[PDB]
Amino acid sequence: NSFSGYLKLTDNVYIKNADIVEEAKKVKPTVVVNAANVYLKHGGGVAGALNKATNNAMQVESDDYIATNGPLKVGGSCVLSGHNLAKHCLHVVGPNVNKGEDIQLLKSAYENFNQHEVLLAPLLSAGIFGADPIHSLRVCVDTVRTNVYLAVFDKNLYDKLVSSF
Numbered sequence: 090n091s092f093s094g095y096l097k098l099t100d101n102v103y104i105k106n107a108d109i110v111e112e113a114k115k116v117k118p119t120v121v122v123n124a125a126n127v128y129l130k131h132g133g134g135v136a137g138a139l140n141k142a143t144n145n146a147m148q149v150e151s152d153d154y155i156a157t158n159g160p161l162k163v164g165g166s167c168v169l170s171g172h173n174l175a176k177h178c179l180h181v182v183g184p185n186v187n188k189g190e191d192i193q194l195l196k197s198a199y200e201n202f203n204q205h206e207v208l209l210a211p212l213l214s215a216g217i218f219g220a221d222p223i224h225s226l227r228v229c230v231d232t233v234r235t236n237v238y239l240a241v242f243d244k245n246l247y248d249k250l251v252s253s254f
């Protein structure tokens with residue numbers, strides 16, 4: 090958990106312009122959050138990037154979790170291995186608002202972070218799930234009570250988030 094170069098936005102939310110994968114390799118945090126879907130199929134966005142950095146070990150473990158437990162619910166989570174990136178990976182499902190899933194579930198999704206004292210995380214529902222990323226940061230700030238270190242790779246978005254905050 091040796092985080093460097095973050096800006097403190099609130100008492101417990103920090104932000105940095107970085108690829109979450111590079112932050113995980115540098116810090117090896119206790120928990121890295123994945124922006125997952127309900128079947129834990131890590132095909133693109135943050136999920137695809139984290140799985141590729143484990144050389145598909147995350148996907149083989151996720152497929153076994155689904156075989157034994159069934160899919161997660163939107164707003165839900167599960168804790169699996171963090172492989173080479175972290176001690177644990179917290180897979181969290183935000184709503185895919187472009188497919189009509191309710192934006193109210195973005196609060197439920199960020200509530201999962203409160204089970205861990207310190208997390209390295211992306212913005213939920215803010216990639217291909219279609220939610221406005223500045224709205225996602227507002228829900229994060231209003232819901233997470235533990236220490237969250239957010240990594241946002243796109244500099245244009247990072248600058249807009251810092252300016253809005």
Ligand SMILES: CC(C)[C@H](CO)Nc1ncnc2[nH]ccc12
Pocket residue numbers: 107108109110134135138211212215216222240241242243246
């Ligand atoms: C979620 C989305 C707004 C954001 C935009 O840069 N994506 C990411 N954020 C952080 N590390 C990442 N690695 C691969 C993608 C990615």
